[PDB]
Amino acid sequence: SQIGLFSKICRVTIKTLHYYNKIGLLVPAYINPDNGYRFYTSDQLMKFHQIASLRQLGFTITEIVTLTQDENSCHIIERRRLEIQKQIRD
Amino acid sequence: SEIGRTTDPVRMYMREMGTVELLTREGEIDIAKRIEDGINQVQCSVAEYPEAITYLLEQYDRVEAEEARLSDLITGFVDIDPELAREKFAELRAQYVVTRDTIKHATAQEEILKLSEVFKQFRLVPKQFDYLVNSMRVMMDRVRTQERLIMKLCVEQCKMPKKNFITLFTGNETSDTWFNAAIAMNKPWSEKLHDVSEEVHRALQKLQQIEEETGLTIEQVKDINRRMSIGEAKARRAKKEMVEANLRLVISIAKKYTNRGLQFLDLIQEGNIGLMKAVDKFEYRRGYKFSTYATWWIRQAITRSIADQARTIRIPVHMIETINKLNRISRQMLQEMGREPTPEELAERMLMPEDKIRKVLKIAKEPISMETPIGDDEDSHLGDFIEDTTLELPLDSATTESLRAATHDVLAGLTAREAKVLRMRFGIDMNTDYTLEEVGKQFDVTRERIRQIEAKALRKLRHPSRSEVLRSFLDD
DNA sequence: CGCCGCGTCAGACTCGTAGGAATCTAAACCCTCCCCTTAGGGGAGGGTCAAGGC
DNA sequence: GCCTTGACCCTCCCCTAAGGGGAGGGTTTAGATTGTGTGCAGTCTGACGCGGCG
């Protein structure tokens, strides 16, 4: 599945997939060596769903990287929760 | 015979181009079959060298864990979904391993040939197959270049007989057993190279690794490579017969591009390059005619070369296409309105903002010749009216010199320190101006003291005693 | 080898203003690279302002 | 006056988060198509080099 098909499957922009590959949040399953074409797989969609689930809670991207690459991060969800209530008061 | 009668290279090309007759639906098919048999022969001659198959199975176990996909390793099978390739790769691995141990010597020619004919089944992607054949070319050409450096040194010494230097060199392959027989004639030439008999070793003892790195004999490698050469010359002679038969198709397509900046033979040659690409990419097993596929590549090459080299100031392909789209929208709006549209409405029928379309309209113009006759005369041309705008006016040069003289005069009427830091702060009679810190360090003084000195010197020069010469060099 | 008709090549005035030439023409993909977006933060490099010290 | 000194101040350049927008570059595209396509010219006269006949 090329990036155009994956961007329509995911309902997200292509530049979003380019950014997520650049930062290392969502890396394509196979990148064509000569062209550079990124190809994706169902196992990449299972991870973009997690990315979207966390990003809809207002987590910053780096917080999403820390949450999906390193487990036992319950202090980060508490930091985001406290910041959300503080922002609600404000 | 028409030889020597015309000067036109178009007529010469058409004349030599029409000496090849068109192919039938059946002629394209067996020319394509000749190409595929040449490439199959190259592959079955590659199969004799094992490390290429080892690299290919490396690629397959990389496809297993998806370091790559086999859609980039094989385009299909002949007697792509990834399940049949497992069967064929397993049966090929079971062949390579059952060939690896059987070494003897007549028995060694059964398994290599059956592995060749069972490796024939894989019709690879061009990239991997080209990598394998180029790898074998590099192996054989380094082996061959030390093979003829063996004779390079023998020419370095003296007169070179090698008519019978080859007699028992063939087959020994381990030691100087062939080398000792050369001095056995004791003709003077057989002297020379023998006192280089030690220096030759690291050539034919570098063979000491490579005959242990390839497994097969020197002429076995050389002759499977000459069979590769025969196969690729068969596939190349068959590609030449398919290009030469279809040049009328290129002229047929190229005649529709004739006045868009490129000349007719330029278009024909670019379409010929496209046609050669089409011959490389054509598949006759799809049942289509060669014209159907080749028209795409010929038109691609011609339109791409028009976008590349039809203009003096090259426009990129994206802007070339924006210009073309704007032009046909203008044609439609001129027909449906009887009036040439304005960029406002030309930007409403298109999807683009008006300021983008204004610069697209300003971007597409070809330069005028400066040999254009002005007045449609032949004595005055456009280049006669164009002025050098980079020239300094002689009154401006004379003003510059008078200003240099006047500032020299007023800087002579200051202290030596103040005039020095004021000629150093600015670039006056130096090649570079300086900062407060550089002037200060050259004086071993601070930045702020130099600032004070130059501010005081400027205040001195502000007085009308020292200013009336310089105030004349200013304007309203 | 010597001469005759044929193919070819090279030349042919200086002031003002008007004053050019105007046809023809892929699309869908992908990539990298560069600049852009808040509301300012941080730093490098280079100047400037009053204090005085001799 | 010459010289430091500490505090300020300026512009300029790069950075921020999460991509947007666009420029400029590659690649393929499978019904079948198989030889361009214009003029234009009312010059004369030398003069030179050459095929072809004698």
From Swiss-Prot, chain B:
<feature type="region of interest" description="Interaction with anti-sigma factors">
    <location>
        <begin position="447"/>
        <end position="462"/>
    </location>
</feature>
<dbReference type="InterPro" id="IPR007631">
    <property type="entry name" value="RNA_pol_sigma_70_non-ess"/>
</dbReference>
<keyword id="KW-0805">Transcription regulation</keyword>
<dbReference type="Pfam" id="PF00140">
    <property type="entry name" value="Sigma70_r1_2"/>
</dbReference>
<dbReference type="InterPro" id="IPR013324">
    <property type="entry name" value="RNA_pol_sigma_r3/r4-like"/>
</dbReference>
<keyword id="KW-0963">Cytoplasm</keyword>
<protein>
    <recommendedName>
        <fullName>RNA polymerase sigma factor RpoD</fullName>
    </recommendedName>
</protein>
<dbReference type="GO" id="GO:1903865">
    <property type="term" value="C:sigma factor antagonist complex"/>
</dbReference>
<dbReference type="Pfam" id="PF04542">
    <property type="entry name" value="Sigma70_r2"/>
</dbReference>
<dbReference type="Pfam" id="PF03979">
    <property type="entry name" value="Sigma70_r1_1"/>
</dbReference>
<dbReference type="InterPro" id="IPR009042">
    <property type="entry name" value="RNA_pol_sigma70_r1_2"/>
</dbReference>
<feature type="region of interest" description="Sigma-70 factor domain-4">
    <location>
        <begin position="410"/>
        <end position="463"/>
    </location>
</feature>
<comment type="similarity">
    <text>Belongs to the sigma-70 factor family. RpoD/SigA subfamily.</text>
</comment>
<dbReference type="InterPro" id="IPR007624">
    <property type="entry name" value="RNA_pol_sigma70_r3"/>
</dbReference>
<dbReference type="InterPro" id="IPR007127">
    <property type="entry name" value="RNA_pol_sigma_70_r1_1"/>
</dbReference>
<dbReference type="GO" id="GO:0005829">
    <property type="term" value="C:cytosol"/>
</dbReference>
<keyword id="KW-0731">Sigma factor</keyword>
<feature type="DNA-binding region" description="H-T-H motif">
    <location>
        <begin position="436"/>
        <end position="455"/>
    </location>
</feature>
<dbReference type="Pfam" id="PF04545">
    <property type="entry name" value="Sigma70_r4"/>
</dbReference>
<dbReference type="Pfam" id="PF04546">
    <property type="entry name" value="Sigma70_ner"/>
</dbReference>
<dbReference type="GO" id="GO:0003677">
    <property type="term" value="F:DNA binding"/>
</dbReference>
<dbReference type="InterPro" id="IPR050239">
    <property type="entry name" value="Sigma-70_RNA_pol_init_factors"/>
</dbReference>
<dbReference type="GO" id="GO:0016987">
    <property type="term" value="F:sigma factor activity"/>
</dbReference>
<keyword id="KW-0238">DNA-binding</keyword>
<comment type="function">
    <text>Sigma factors are initiation factors that promote the attachment of RNA polymerase to specific initiation sites and are then released. This sigma factor is the primary sigma factor during exponential growth. Preferentially transcribes genes associated with fast growth, such as ribosomal operons, other protein-synthesis related genes, rRNA- and tRNA-encoding genes and prfB.</text>
</comment>
<dbReference type="GO" id="GO:0009408">
    <property type="term" value="P:response to heat"/>
</dbReference>
<dbReference type="GO" id="GO:0000345">
    <property type="term" value="C:cytosolic DNA-directed RNA polymerase complex"/>
</dbReference>
<dbReference type="InterPro" id="IPR042189">
    <property type="entry name" value="RNA_pol_sigma_70_r1_1_sf"/>
</dbReference>
<feature type="region of interest" description="Sigma-70 factor domain-3">
    <location>
        <begin position="321"/>
        <end position="397"/>
    </location>
</feature>
<dbReference type="Pfam" id="PF04539">
    <property type="entry name" value="Sigma70_r3"/>
</dbReference>
<keyword id="KW-0804">Transcription</keyword>
<dbReference type="GO" id="GO:0045892">
    <property type="term" value="P:negative regulation of DNA-templated transcription"/>
</dbReference>
<dbReference type="InterPro" id="IPR028630">
    <property type="entry name" value="Sigma70_RpoD"/>
</dbReference>
<dbReference type="InterPro" id="IPR036388">
    <property type="entry name" value="WH-like_DNA-bd_sf"/>
</dbReference>
<comment type="subunit">
    <text>Interacts transiently with the RNA polymerase catalytic core formed by RpoA, RpoB, RpoC and RpoZ (2 alpha, 1 beta, 1 beta' and 1 omega subunit) to form the RNA polymerase holoenzyme that can initiate transcription. Identified in a complex containing RpoD, the RNA polymerase subunits RpoA, RpoB and RpoZ, CRP and DNA. Interacts with Rsd; this prevents interaction with the RNA polymerase catalytic core and with promoter DNA, and as a consequence, promotes transcription from promoters that require alternative sigma factors.</text>
</comment>
<feature type="site" description="Interaction with anti-sigma factors">
    <location>
        <position position="425"/>
    </location>
</feature>
<dbReference type="GO" id="GO:0006352">
    <property type="term" value="P:DNA-templated transcription initiation"/>
</dbReference>
<dbReference type="InterPro" id="IPR007627">
    <property type="entry name" value="RNA_pol_sigma70_r2"/>
</dbReference>
<comment type="subunit">
    <text>(Microbial infection) Interacts with Escherichia phage lambda antitermination protein Q.</text>
</comment>
<dbReference type="GO" id="GO:2000142">
    <property type="term" value="P:regulation of DNA-templated transcription initiation"/>
</dbReference>
<dbReference type="InterPro" id="IPR012760">
    <property type="entry name" value="RNA_pol_sigma_RpoD_C"/>
</dbReference>
<feature type="region of interest" description="Sigma-70 factor domain-2">
    <location>
        <begin position="242"/>
        <end position="312"/>
    </location>
</feature>
